[PDB]
């Protein structure tokens, strides 16, 4: 099975590293789908960001994408989307575009796994924030997000 | 009874006018009120979208307003305000206005209807988002407004 | 209009009789469905609290019923079904059986109206938890359950 | 892949059905794993109701486990449990069981896949509910359920 | 000890009041913390309603900040921060900032006190909303937060 | 200030104990109030736990009580109540209770904990239940909580 999973990643955290190697380690291929159309970091380096604190993963892929999520999907040739969910998570509007792509691409589905409990309450927005102010967000990101906040921040 | 259906709908979804259909069938009197002051569609093209769209209901009225709701409310002589409910709606923010209506309307009620269920993960924000990419949005609201925004969107 | 409050009403508490109260003010005719099949007081004794609490409102007449309230809806030619809400109340559990009754009985709605914020946490289970160990639960309960309880707790 | 589907199933439901189907879309291989330890059915009961509303899905089999279910996990070799969740699910419980499964059975991930939204608001509770007074929940679960059910009442 | 009471308060609702009192009662000292940078209301404005509101409060002082919120708690020597829930308040938002603010200074805490159950719907966004079109926002906020929302807005 | 941490404790978990580790460093007093009255260990057992438990940390102290909370926290000449809330707790719940309480001993506040983000999901149920069936809780329970359910469950 060949699983989509979408985001903005502006810029990937811990969090949204947690779900891809537990894709990773369930399904046959994983192909992180970068979301490009305000965000800190340009879709390029977003992708960049990714490609390097995934580059362990043997079977995961990533690549920017415009327009609708379900014409990637059919694009690459996934079987499924694949989302993370945490306890603060916006449980009603991913439950909202999971049944939406069910419909545009009939039939296909968002399976949705459980990121590590220790990254529950970490979110892109707040990372960002932090660093902004100068505070230390290294346990909170991958060391290839900590270099691009660095460098984009100034710090 | 009469009541009022506020909302801006931008633009008006199924689950929009299902809640205005069951209201006019237990209501004596609905008037929706279409909120006016960025909006895709303008108070002008909304209005006219639900005209056409309530068109079949004969005890459904629309029209534009702004300033305060219950001030609509008080002008149009209606007992109540209605409201749809989805297991997605922000249940929160609806019971916050629901009891500020009453304190400035001592004792306005407002009244929450259950949209139905098909179209419970339905919003006007994903409609738009999903017709600006060319996507399908045929069963998600009415003739009327799919016709707006091919216009709108000129597809 | 004609609608059916139910519930067990065991016993009835200041949230319960608010919300019918407002029913009242909006509403032609109000029954109180009294649900009768472990509670604290029997059938007759709840009905006979809200008898006595709800005597100064014109319009509410109180019954018990056994079997589905749809049932009970139709026995005596009610329009739809009022349930109250409470910033605490189980929303889910609500929304669930407002969609099953109107599958049940094809097209019956439930209506919602918000309980008196002051009344937002009150509940029958937590007054008599209260009222058993001897606390004041005066504030919380009409004056008929307030002497029900203290005859039935023997305080 | 192969998946784990449990649940006490008291009885089946559309909703869990639709949830089955989905899963055997998805994956190689499915199996229903039916709690047996006060339920309405018998837990052979139960499994007879599920053998006979699978029997269209190929590569979907089902038993009865007693103990934890990762021990059952374990023992029929799968990779991955399944549950599927509703706008109405109690989120916060199936959160709970993904994380602690994940410790007892170390990385055993679930995964979880939204079901139809026409049976959204389907439980097995409410069935037997409703059922127990004649009402008529045909569309509620399947026809191997309505036969058990009838049966069981004697209605 | 010594607590800290954050946000922007633009304006300072009864909520927010409420909440500062109760603290006010329960701890020794209490800094409330203006955030400082689009606010209806400067810094300076901001501070100069809380102070002029929590006069009659011995022990509660004020004060402005940028940054990060962990770096004036250890600049003001508090041991912990205290915000205020309600029925309505985005419980997942304060939670995350919670866990945050206690990885950012270590072991630092935060308190959470439930504000007045009459205020449980007031929010300084909906106050705004209100004001602006000439609603009576008097009973919403205090007296200082009256009289600048009647200069702010030349009403 | 002299708080109390009321539960039933049946039995301690590694959630509750990190909440009164945190309560033990932020207040001068803390008092476990174990509630008497069907539980898996007696009063006088899940005290002893708690006794155990909490030996390292010399400002807490633990006893059991019947009848109202709010009338132990008086006989003690407590100033507040604690509880710990987890993105997984009864939320209104928790909220309910601290509401009466408030009313029940006028002013009495409840102060809310954020138990660790590693125990977010652990409850005593759940141990129970993985504990019966031999399942290792380890992890979940401090080690006076381990020894009492191997000699309770003869394991
Ligand atoms: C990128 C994302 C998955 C959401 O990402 P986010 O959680 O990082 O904000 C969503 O916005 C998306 O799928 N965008 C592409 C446009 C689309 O397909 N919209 C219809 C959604 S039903
Ligand atoms: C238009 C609406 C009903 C909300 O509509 P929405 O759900 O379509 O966003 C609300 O914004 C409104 O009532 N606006 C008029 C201004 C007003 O009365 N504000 C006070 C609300 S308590
Ligand atoms: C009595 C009540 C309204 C719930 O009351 P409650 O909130 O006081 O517990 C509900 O249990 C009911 O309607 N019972 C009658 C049986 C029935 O119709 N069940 C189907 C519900 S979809
Ligand atoms: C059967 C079920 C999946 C829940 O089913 P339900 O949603 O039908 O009530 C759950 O109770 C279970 O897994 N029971 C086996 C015992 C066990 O493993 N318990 C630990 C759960 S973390
Ligand atoms: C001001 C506030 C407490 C939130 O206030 P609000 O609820 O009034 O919007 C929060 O934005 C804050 O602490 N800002 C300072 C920057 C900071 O410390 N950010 C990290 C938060 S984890
Ligand atoms: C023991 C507890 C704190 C709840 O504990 P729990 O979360 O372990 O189930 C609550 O049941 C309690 O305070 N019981 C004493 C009786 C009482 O005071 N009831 C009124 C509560 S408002």
Same mark, same amino acid.
């Given at each position: 099975?060949?699983?989509?999973?979408?985001?903005?990643?502006?810029?990937? $955290?811990?969090?949204?590293?947690? @779900?891809? /190697? #537990?894709?990773? #380690?369930?399904?046959?291929?994983?192909?992180?789908?970068?979301? &490009?159309?305000?965000? %800190?970091?340009?879709? &390029?380096?977003?992708? !960049?960001?990714? #490609?390097?604190? $995934?580059?362990?993963? *043997?079977?995961?892929?990533? !690549?920017?994408?415009?327009?609708?999520?379900?014409?990637?999907? #059919?694009?690459?040739?996934? /079987? !499924?989307?694949?989302?993370?969910?945490?306890?603060?998570?916006?449980?009603?509007? &991913?439950? /909202?575009?999971?049944?939406?792509?069910? /419909? %545009?691409?009939?039939?296909?589905? $968002? =399976?949705?796994? =459980? !990121? *590590? $409990?220790?990254?529950?309450?970490?979110?892109?927005?707040?990372?960002?924030?932090?660093?902004?102010?100068?505070?230390? @967000?290294?346990? %909170?990101?991958?060391?290839?997000?900590?270099?691009?906040?660095?460098?984009?921040?100034?710090?």
């Amino acid at each position: 099975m060949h699983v989509v999973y979408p985001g903005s990643f502006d810029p990937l $955290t811990n969090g949204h590293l947690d @779900v891809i /190697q #537990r894709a990773s #380690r369930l399904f046959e291929k994983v192909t992180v789908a970068v979301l &490009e159309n305000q965000y %800190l970091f340009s879709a &390029e380096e977003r992708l !960049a960001i990714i #490609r390097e604190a $995934t580059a362990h993963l *043997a079977n995961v892929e990533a !690549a920017t994408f415009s327009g609708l999520l379900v014409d990637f999907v #059919r694009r690459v040739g996934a /079987q !499924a989307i694949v989302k993370g969910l945490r306890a603060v998570s916006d449980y009603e509007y &991913e439950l /909202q575009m999971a049944h939406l792509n069910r /419909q %545009l691409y009939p039939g296909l589905e $968002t =399976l949705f796994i =459980l !990121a *590590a $409990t220790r990254y529950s309450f970490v979110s892109s927005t707040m990372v960002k924030e932090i660093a902004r102010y100068g505070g230390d @967000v290294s346990k %909170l990101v991958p060391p290839a997000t900590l270099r691009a906040l660095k460098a984009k921040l100034g710090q």
